[PDB]
Amino acid sequence: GQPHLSRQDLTTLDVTKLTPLSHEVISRQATINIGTIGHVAHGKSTVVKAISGVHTVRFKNELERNITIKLGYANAKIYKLDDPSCPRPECYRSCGSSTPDEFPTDIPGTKGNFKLVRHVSFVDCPGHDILMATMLNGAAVMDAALLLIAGNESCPQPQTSEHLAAIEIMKLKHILILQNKIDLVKESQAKEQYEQILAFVQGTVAEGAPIIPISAQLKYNIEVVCEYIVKKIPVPPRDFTSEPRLIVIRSFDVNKPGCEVDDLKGGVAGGSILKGVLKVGQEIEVRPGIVSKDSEGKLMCKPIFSKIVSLFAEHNDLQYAAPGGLIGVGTKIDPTLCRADRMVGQVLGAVGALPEIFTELEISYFLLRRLLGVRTEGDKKAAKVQKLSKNEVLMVNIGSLSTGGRVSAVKADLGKIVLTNPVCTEVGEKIALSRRVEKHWRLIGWGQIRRGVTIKPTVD
C-alpha cells in the first residue's frame, strides 16, 4: 500500500515458500529479533538509535502503562553494497525501515547501488523482563543478543554480572559484544578493558564472540556490527505454515476526538507473531476477549471474533504479516474494547486455533535461591530468594504474555497460582516467575503447567 517498496500480493503468496530471508517480507517488516542486553547510561538506547535511526511510532497512547515492563521494538534495515571495490565493512550499512529497497551510494565507492539484505528488530526492555520473558518458553522472542559494555568503567562493573547471567539463562548461542563509549578511552585503557572482558567471559557462552569497539554517539564502527549481524548471526528457523498466533502487547484507539462517523475505525492491536502468517481479511478470534463477572461474581469469557482490516509494521503497510517484529493488526473490534492498552494479555489467532483459557494454574516450580549475577554488598539476605508463601503475588510470564498471580497453596513443589485475569495457554508450557524485590520485578524461578482450572468460553 506504500510506494518505493516491494509489492505484496495475497494471491501471489504461498506459506510454504516463505522463508526468513524472503525479499518480499524483509522489504516491509523485520524477520529476525536481536535483543540488546545492555544498561541505561551506558549507551543501551543510543546504540539502537544510531543503528535504526529515529522512530516516530504510528499510534501512541496519551498514557503509557507498564513502561518498565513493555518490550520495545526497533526495526532496522541492513544493506550490502554490491561493488567489490568498496572495502568491508563499509559496504554494509544500517538505516530505517522506510527506506526503499535500493538507493544509490552516498560515498565515493566508485558507483554501486545498495541492495536490501536483512531487516532486524531490536527487543529492548527498560530492565530485565526479557529474562523471564524468554527464559523457558523459548518461542521466537529472539535468536541473537547484543551484550553492551561501556568503556569509561572497568570490567566487570557491578551491572555486568547480571547481564552475563542473563545471557547464560536465555540459552542464547549467538551473542555479539559491543564496547561502547570507548571514544574517550586511551588505547592502553581499552586494551586492559578488553583483557578484563575476556577474563570475565572466559568459560562462558561469550567465549567465541566479537568484542567490537563502537562509539554510538559518533556512529563509529556500526558497519562492523552490521557485518557481524550478516555473517555471525545465523538465519533462525521459523514456522510459517501453522495457524497464526499473536500475543497482544499494545492496543490503541485511533479515532481522534470530534471525528466524523464515516471516519470511525476499529481497534488497532499491536503484538508479536509466534507461528504462522496473518492475512488481510482473515477471520480472527481474540481470547479470552470480553471477561466479565456474573451477578454473584462468577468469571465468564466471550472471545472476540473480528476480521483483519489492515496490517502495519512501524510506518509500513502490509498485506501479510510474518513473525519477526511488532505487527499492529487494525481490526473491526469496537474501539471501546481496545482503548488505552485494554486488550494487552490476550491471544489473537485463527478461528478455532487457540489454546485453552485458564484461571488457575498448578505448576511444578523450581525456585531460584540467589538473584542471577548480583553482588551481595553488605546485606547478605538481600540477594537471598525466600521460599514461596501463601497469598503472595508473583508475576507469571508465559513468553510475552504477562499476568499476575496469587499463590494459593504449595504442597512440596506443586504451587497453585490464581491468575488475576484468565489467560490462554496449554497444559505443559514452560512458565517463569517474578517477585517484587524492590522497585522492580526480578526472576525467582520457573516451572511447568502440570494442570489447571479452565473456563468454558461462552459464544452467542
Binding site: 572495502p87 568491508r88 570507548i182 571514544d183 588505547e187 581499552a190 586494551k191 578488553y194 566479537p210 568484542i211 567490537i212 569497539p213 563502537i214 562509539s215 559518533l218 563509529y220 564502527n221 562492523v224 557481524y228 555473517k231 555471525k232
Partner: peptide, 24 residues
C-alpha cells in the same frame, strides 16, 4: 585493506577507531 572474510580481532577494530578520532 585485506581479504578478511574471516572474523577479525579486537586489535584491528580498536586501532581503526583510534585512527578515526585521531584524524578528526
Amino acid at each position: 585493506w585485506a581479504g578478511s572474510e574471516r572474523d577479525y580481532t579486537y586489535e584491528e577494530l580498536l586501532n581503526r577507531v583510534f585512527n578515526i578520532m585521531r584524524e578528526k
